[PDB]
Symmetry: C3
């Protein structure tokens, strides 16, 4: 008896050093949880505006994953933007669905 709920999935890629910042940001905005993939590396621009700080080969990156109602997305990107002005990183927004028993 499963029904699908639409949500937005955010993949937040940034340096590991800034994990606590990013994660307090999610907490304060009312995100109900996240998971973290470690040991990413990277290179160059990952889809952002020209001039956005690139990754390079000695960045230890993580990916923070948050599944979030659509309404939370705008406020979260506005929250991260001051951060991205001075640090490398990107947020990929996806459509996903999650199954819940009726």
């Amino acid at each position: 008896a499963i029904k699908l709920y639409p949500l937005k999935k955010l993949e937040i890629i940034l340096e590991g050093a800034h994990k606590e910042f990013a994660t307090d940001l999610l907490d304060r905005a009312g995100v109900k949880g996240y998971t973290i993939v470690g040991n990413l590396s990277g290179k160059g621009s990952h889809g952002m505006y020209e001039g956005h700080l690139m990754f390079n080969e000695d960045d230890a990156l993580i990916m923070i994953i948050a599944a979030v109602p659509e309404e939370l997305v705008g406020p979260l990107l506005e929250g991260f933007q001051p951060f991205f002005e001075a640090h490398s990183g990107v947020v990929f927004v996806h459509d996903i669905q999650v199954g819940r028993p009726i």
Copy 2:
């Protein structure tokens, strides 16, 4: 001479201890393969119904990825649901495409 095929991509996040369970479940349902990302960690609710068991900071999580025909999705979520009633974890369903030569 590439043509795109639509499929569903499942990201199954759960504790590593239950890898074999989850993976027998995929096998028995006729999923043709999967990949596994190790060394995830997590915290809190990741998009599920209120009361669903949260992750916490000493969970060693994995992500199982299966690309699956649309028809297999309902049966797979029904398969995992008894499991999720007593264990933390989530399944993210995405739309993806995979290229095949004509």
Copy 3:
């Protein structure tokens, strides 16, 4: 003042041994950057045509992630196809959006 841009997100899963090949391929095609998730493992067919080489249990896999304009996708899948004819692996194409300040 955020506006969303649509892009294609490619998840390229293959053996670690072939990282430099795949990554020169992205460079030569004009992809502006990528990130890499290490320590994947896998098994079987991951959505490809019947007969495509499967992963097995002693493959050390990586995932290469590139966010790419829609126009770059066809040429990139054509680039990888000779490679996939003799090696295991897959490319998952997603729709994503990335936020940019106006």
